[PDB]
Each structure stands twice: as structure tokens, then as C-alpha cells.
DNA sequence: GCGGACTGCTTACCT
DNA sequence: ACAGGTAAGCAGTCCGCG
């Protein structure tokens, strides 16, 4: 089993290390072989020797063209010839790749921004998370005394826990009688003990809940200011820092630093990410957080040091649980996209796509295209039309079935062979056009997409059919993951076209893919009314909500298999409509909002109050209550007085505050914004008392009694009090509960007044 | 000027 | 930022009024 790459320099000269787990045993293996390189097209071979002569420095070394040999490949379909430039060691790409391509025989430069130890993956055709290898890991957090506007790192850490499957135990330097606590000589000895922990432990995996920002971080600050050498790494080597965009991430050679942050943020949709809040989604137990205040008052005072200790296990032991939930997925979709956990884990579905296609691409002999420069991607500033939201038939119906197309835009994709290759391709025999964008796609041969996406599918039938002929609990489960993220992978590629930071961005197959959908659901609804006595209540994008008025439940159904018995035969290669579900009854407030309730009586919300994080608990729970007697039963009165038990016991300051909490992300930088609002300006605040606002920081505000902008009165959910602040009945009840409720019941003839105390 | 209509910014949903 | 389509809160600005 393959962990990850790297590379060290020894006397100059470039060095490949391969971290692999092989017979429950950790090796390091050394290519000293691999050469870096990329690629230039050049207007005439006769300026090689020109081109090779081309010269730079870099950090006090003249920097040269190792060799160059001539090779053919594909850009595009088409064979190019280009020249491969070897170079000796990796950094001197980035210092040669500008001058190279500045020089006048060269026409561009191909492939010069790829990290050597993913070269090497790929171009070795290594697929890192092989095999049936068991790996140990070690979750990890810390407790700190933290004061209001100080540094980073000027607070002592007090606490390191760290828990596996046998044990979960917290190291302090303070005297505290509880068995699992280690009282140490100081914070230095106790730092120093996690190490000889680790060193003995020797884990395969550190795992974190958000220790790229945090946790390791704050160690490193401590380590210098106790000038102790923080080895973690297997070589011997301390923790390294790498930038990621707008956030940082820590890399421990050797082991695979698991942070579930980024996981937990990209794979599950919730209000805050708090531990507390993760582990109660995930696992469905409760955690009670301690805080700041309370944990240096509990140190200072030493009083209550046994809760805090408590915390810090339980901290560490919810971290690991939850590493031992989502490793696996995560080291499944390691060996689909072929890099490293730790790169995978951290990555954007952008990143993933693309280092999928740089893989494929390397195998096929395909030219990768370059990322795009300042003023080529601002010629990809421009949007294209999405998918055809039909204007929903508003009010409650019955008898309501859903039909919706299967992978449809991968379906299209292949079926149309949409591909930057394919696309005008000059002098074909058959072609498809896109509807309306008018676009010709070339049918004699496969495209690059279209024949990787044709791959996956049947990949994914040969997975589901393994699946089917195993026993082994565990072996099914890894297999799920496999087809789970094949499909995940697949429904990427129509948003990977359209995104103007992609290689292989295609504005024009973007367009086709949406215009080819546009025409199947258009066409499924014209058809359904036009010929089968359906009225289509409401239409998405590859969807659609149908029922025959003056008819029941049995003629619904049954009327609805036949039409796709009939269409789905008209319809193209991939291109098939389904039968997802038949509903009792069918609410449909507006566009994107709608709710249905089926035959054992589970009722489906989408995109109303209930489903969004920027609405207040009190007023979801209400609308849920709302529908549910709109839906379940029939009582438009019971609504209503549901409505009249909110709002007065709003009005006599009942509910309780958890209740009255709205959660709003922040974006972007602080000065960025170009308007406020009650979450901006709570965010501003905390800010300048120095508390850390990055892009993805949730911010939960509770509103006070008072008038005008929201925002002047509107303060962290952290900081309410019922001693001196006071809730703002008038808001919760005309700005939260009453618009909520009013959706829901403004079709039956109720104006905001009449449900009101 | 008042006060409601309207609209840009913004978020989070839907597919 | 993997895409566009959409509704709606908030806080400014707009604009109709007798
Ligand atoms: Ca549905
Ligand atoms: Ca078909």
C-alpha cells in the first residue's frame, strides 16, 4: 500500500522517496532515476540548438537543458510533435519556463507546473492506497489557555490528548486524580512526552479536527518559544506548514495527517461545525463543549480541572471514531483519482477531476493543455444558460408521481460525444448538434471525456456486480465507496467543462450538455401533456413533478410506467427516464420550493425555511409543523393555531434561545464586502477584538430587542444573557416565524395579520 | 418628506 | 468556485403621493 511521494535533493541532483506500507511493516523506497521535464512546440526543428543554448539562474546555479528529445503525441485528437526538455533538478523548471517560452522559434510550453513527486505517480502509473494493508492511527487534540485579543501562541497549551481503538488518555502538568490523566514536570515535559507517545505509538495516521489551522500550529509556536525540536516525521524531519489556497496544511512525512475538517465540511451540510455538532450528526449522541473562559478560570483557579480533562478525552476519542469512519471512503477515492490521502482529502472536486484526467491523459499519450493566464481567464468571464426550471402549478395536489432522468448530463456526455476533441472537428462524416448553441460534436471517433465517463460506467457495473457475489461485510462496504464516488466522479465532468480554472475547460461543451438537457425534459413534458393526459405541476433540470387530474393513485402509477415504456425507446443511446416515487399529496410553494408526502407518510422537504442555516430553529420547526398538518393531515385550522402558539409564546420571551440562533457564513475577507448585514457586522466586531475570521467561519447571532438596522443589535449566540440582553420578540415573530408560515398558508387565503397573538 | 416599492448584495438552497 | 437557476433577507435608494 502506497502512502505518498516525495523528493529530497542530495549533491544537486533530484531524489524520489516512496512511503509504503508492505507485510504490516513501514518502508522507504529511493528512485534517484526520474528526470523532471516539460514540453515546448516550436515553429521549425532546425532552432533546437538555439532553444537548448537558453540559459537562467536560479538562487546562485546556471540553471540548462539536461538533453531534448523529439516525440509525438495528441493535443486535442490531432498528433503534435513536440520537444521534451529534461532538466536536473525539479526546481529549475520554474526558473527556465518563462524564458523558454519567451524565445522566439518556441510557439508554447506544455506541462511545467506539475509537482515532481505527482509526476512521478502518474508518469510510474502509481496508484497510492493499494491493497488490503491495515493501517494504525492516533487521534490527536489540544486544550489551551486562551485570553480575549492576544496572539497566537502566546497561551500555554495545558492539555495533549490522543486516543486509538485500546486507549484515551489527556497529559497535563497539573495535579489531577482521574485515572487517564498523566501529570508531567511542565508544559515542556508534557510536549515532550507526546513525542516519546508518538515515537512508541509509532501511528501510521495523526488524526486532527481542524489541526491544519489549529492544533499543530499553535505546537510548532510553543516548540520554537521552548526550543524543543518537534519530530513527528518517520525520517526524523519536524511538521511542515503548506499554503492551500486561502487556508494552510500541515504535512508529517512518513505518517498521513487525517484533518476531518475539510472532510466533514466537503462530504455532510450543517448549520455549524463544531465537534459537538459532527459527532451528534454522524453518530447521533450528544458532546457538551467547554470553553475558553471556563478552561483558563479552571487552570487559574484549579477548581475544576477534572471537566476540562474530561473534555479533552472525549475530544480525542470523537476525533478518532470519526477517522475510523471516514478513512476508508476517503482512501478509496485516493486510489480513483491517484494521489495521495492527504492531497485528496484537502482537495476541491476541480483539483480531483483534473489530477484524474492528468492520470488518463498520461496513459492515452494526450498533451495536457496549460492552465489558464490573467487575460485567458478573463475571456472565460462570460456564463452560458444552466437547466430549465419550469414556473411550479402553486397549491396542494394528489396523486403525484416523480420522474426524473438517470445521470443525465454524464448520459448526454457520451451519448453526443461531448469533448474538446470532437468539438468542430474539421472534415467528419456523422455529427451531433446541440439544440439552440448550435454546436457540432464528431461521431466517428470517441472523445477523451466521453470515453473515460463510458469506462466508469461499466467499471462501476463490474463493482456492483462483485458486490452482488461477496460476503465479506467489510470487503462490500470498500467496494460501495468505489462505485458511490465512480458516480460522484462522473456528474463532475459537465461542471469541470464549465470551469474557466480547468485545463481542460470547454465553454461550448458546457453549453451543448445544458441545451441537449433543456431539449430531453422540455420534450419528456411536451409529450407527457400533449398526447398522455398529464398536467406537469413542476420541472427542474433532468426532473419532474406529473399527475392526470380526474384520475387515482392506480391510474397515476400505472399510466406513468407506460409512458416511459413508450419514450425511453425514442430517446437516445444513455438517455432514460425513471420512476423515482409516487407522493399522496404535493405542496408547491414556488420555484425550487416544495414539499410531498408518500404512501407509508414521509414528508420530502426542498429549498423551503425548514432546509436553510440563515433561518432561526423556531421558525423552521414551526413551518415543519405548518406543512405537516397541511400534508399529513388535512387541517388548514390546526396550522393556524400552531401559528398562535409560536408567536405568543414568542411574545412572553418563552422561547428559549437555542431556538433563536441563524447561522450565515462568512465568504470572502472581511474588507471585501461591499455590504453589510446582522452576520458581516457581527463577524467586524469579533475582529477587531482579534478573533480569527477566515473564509468557511459560520457565524451564529442571536437578534436583541430594539429598531432599525438588524445588524446594530445583533451579537454572537456565545454571548447572550438573559441578565442584561433581552431577545427581539417583534423580530423572531414578523421577520423569522410569520414570513415562514405565510408561504405555506398565504394559498389558502391567511394574510400575516390573522395569524398573529 | 414619508413610507412603501424596488433593487444590489448576499446566502444557501436545487439539479 | 465543478455549473447555472432561483427565492428571499437586509439595507440602501427610488418614487409616487394630493
Ligand atoms: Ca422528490
Ligand atoms: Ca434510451
Redesign the pocket.
Known amino acids: 500500500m502506497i502512502l505518498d511521494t516525495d523528493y529530497i535533493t542530495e549533491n544537486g541532483k533530484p531524489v524520489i522517496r516512496v512511503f509504503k506500507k508492505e507485510n504490516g511493516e513501514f518502508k522507504i523506497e529511493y528512485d534517484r532515476t526520474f528526470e523532471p521535464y516539460f514540453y515546448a512546440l516550436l515553429k521549425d526543428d532546425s532552432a533546437i540548438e538555439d532553444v537548448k543554448k537558453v540559459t537562467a539562474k536560479r538562487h546562485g546555479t546556471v540553471v540548462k537543458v539536461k538533453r531534448a528529445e523529439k516525440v509525438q503525441k495528441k493535443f486535442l485528437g490531432r498528433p503534435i510533435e513536440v520537444w521534451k526538455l529534461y532538466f536536473n533538478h525539479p526546481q529549475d523548471v520554474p526558473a527556465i519556463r518563462d524564458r523558454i517560452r519567451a524565445h522566439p522559434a518556441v510557439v508554447d510550453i506544455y506541462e511545467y507546473d506539475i509537482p515532481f513527486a505527482k509526476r512521478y505517480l502518474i508518469d510510474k502509473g502509481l496508484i497510492p492506497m493499494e491493497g488490503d494493508e491495515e493501517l494504525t492511527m492516533l487521534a490527536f487534540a489540544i486544550a489551551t489557555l486562551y485570553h480575549e485579543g492576544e496572539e497566537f501562541g502566546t497561551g500555554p497549551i495545558l492539555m495533549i490528548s490522543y486516543a486509538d481503538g485500546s486507549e484515551a488518555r489527556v497529559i497535563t502538568w497539573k495535579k489531577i486524580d482521574l485515572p487517564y490523566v498523566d501529570v508531567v514536570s511542565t508544559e515542556k515535559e508534557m510536549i515532550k512526552r507526546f513525542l516519546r507517545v508518538v515515537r512508541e505509538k509509532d501511528p501510521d495516521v495523526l488524526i486532527t479536527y481542524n489541526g491544519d489551522n489549529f492544533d499543530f500550529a499553535y505546537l510548532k509556536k510553543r516548540c520554537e518559544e521552548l526550543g524543543i525540536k518537534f519530530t513527528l516525521g518517520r525520517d526524523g524531519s519536524e511538521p511542515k506548514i503548506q499554503r492551500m489556497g486561502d487556508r494552510f496544511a500541515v504535512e508529517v512525512k512518513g505518517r498521513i495527517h487525517f484533518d476531518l475538517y475539510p472532510v466533514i465540511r466537503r462530504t455532510i451540510?450543517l448549520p455549524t461545525y463544531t465537534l459537538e455538532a459532527v459527532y451528534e450528526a454522524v453518530f447521533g449522541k450528544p458532546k457538551e463543549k467547554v470553553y475558553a473562559e471556563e478552561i483558563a478560570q479552571a487552570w487559574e483557579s484549579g477548581e475544576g480541572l477534572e471537566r476540562v480533562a474530561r473534555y479533552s478525552m472525549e475530544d480525542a476519542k470523537v476525533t478518532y471514531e470519526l477517522g475510523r469512519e471516514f478513512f476508508p471512503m476517503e482512501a478509496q477515492l485516493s486510489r480513483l483519482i491517484g494521489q495521495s490521502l492527504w492531497d485528496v482529502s484537502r482537495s476541491?472536486?476541480?483539483?480531483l477531476v483534473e489530477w484524474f484526467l492528468l492520470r488518463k491523459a498520461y496513459k492515452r499519450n494526450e498533451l495536457a493543455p496549460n492552465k489558464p493566464d490573467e487575460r485567458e481567464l478573463a475571456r472565460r468571464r462570460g456564463?452560458?444558460?444552466?437547466?430549465y426550471?419550469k414556473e411550479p402549478e402553486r397549491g396542494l395536489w394528489d396523486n403525484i408521481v416523480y420522474l426524473?432522468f438517470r445521470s443525465l448530463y454524464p448520459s448526454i456526455i457520451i451519448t453526443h460525444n461531448v469533448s474538446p476533441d470532437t468539438l468542430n472537428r474539421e472534415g467528419c462524416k456523422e455529427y451531433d448538434v446541440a439544440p439552440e448553441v448550435g454546436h457540432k460534436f464528431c461521431k466517428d471517433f470517441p472523445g477523451f471525456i466521453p470515453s473515460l465517463l463510458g469506462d466508469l460506467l461499466e467499471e462501476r457495473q463490474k463493482i456492483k456486480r462483485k458486490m452482488k457475489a461477496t460476503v465479506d461485510p467489510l470487503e462490500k462496504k470498500l467496494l460501495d465507496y468505489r462505485q458511490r464516488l465512480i458516480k460522484i466522479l462522473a456528474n463532475?465532468f459537465?461542471?469541470?467543462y464549465?470551469?474557466?480554472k480547468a485545463r481542460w475547460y470547454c465553454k461550448e461543451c458546457?453549453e451543448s450538455v445544458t441545451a441537449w438537457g433543456r431539449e430531453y425534459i422540455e420534450m419528456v413534458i411536451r409529450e407527457l401533456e400533449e398526447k398522455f393526459g398529464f398536467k406537469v405541476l413542476y420541472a427542474?433540470?433532468?426532473?419532474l413533478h406529473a399527475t392526470i387530474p380526474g384520475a387515482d393513485a392506480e391510474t397515476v402509477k400505472k399510466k406513468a410506467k407506460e409512458f416511459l415504456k413508450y419514450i425511453n425507446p425514442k430517446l437516445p443511446g444513455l438517455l432514460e427516464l425513471e420512476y423515482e416515487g409516487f407522493y399522496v399529496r404535493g405542496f408547491f410553494?414556488?420555484?425550487?420550493?416544495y414539499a410531498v408526502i408518500d404512501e407509508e407518510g414521509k414528508i420530502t422537504?426542498?429549498?423551503l425555511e425548514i432546509?436553510?442555516?440563515?433561518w432561526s430553529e423556531i421558525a423552521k420547526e414551526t413551518q415543519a409543523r405548518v406543512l405537516e398538518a397541511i400534508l399529513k393531515h388535512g387541517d388548514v385550522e390546526e396550522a393556524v393555531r400552531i401559528v398562535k402558539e409560536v408567536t405568543e409564546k414568542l411574545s412572553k420571551y418563552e422561547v428559549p434561545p437555542e431556538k433563536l440562533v441563524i447561522?450565515?457564513?462568512?465568504?470572502?475577507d472581511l474588507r471585501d464586502?461591499?455590504?453589510?448585514?446582522?452576520?458581516?457586522?457581527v463577524a467586524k466586531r469579533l475582529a477587531a477584538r482579534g478573533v480569527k475570521i477566515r473564509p468557511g467561519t459560520?457565524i451564529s447571532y442571536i437578534v436583541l430587542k430594539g429598531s432599525g438596522?438588524?445588524?446594530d443589535r445583533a451579537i454572537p449566540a456565545d454571548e447572550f444573557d438573559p441578565t442584561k440582553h433581552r431577545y427581539d420578540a417583534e423580530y423572531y415573530i414578523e421577520?423569522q416565524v410569520l414570513?415562514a408560515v405565510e408561504?405555506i398558508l398565504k394559498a389558502f387565503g391567511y394574510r400575516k395579520e390573522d395569524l398573529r397573538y
Do not use: L, M
Not at 383 to 387: D, E, H, N, V
Not at 663 to 668: A, C, G, L, P, S
Not at 673 to 681: E, I, M, Q, R
Open positions: 451540510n476541491s472536486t476541480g483539483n456564463g452560458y444558460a444552466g437547466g426550471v426524473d463532475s459537465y461542471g469541470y464549465g470551469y474557466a458546457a427542474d433540470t433532468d426532473g410553494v414556488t420555484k425550487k420550493k422537504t426542498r429549498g432546509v436553510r442555516r440563515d447561522h450565515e457564513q462568512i465568504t470572502r464586502y461591499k455590504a453589510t448585514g446582522p452576520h458581516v457586522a459560520v438596522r438588524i445588524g421577520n414570513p408561504r
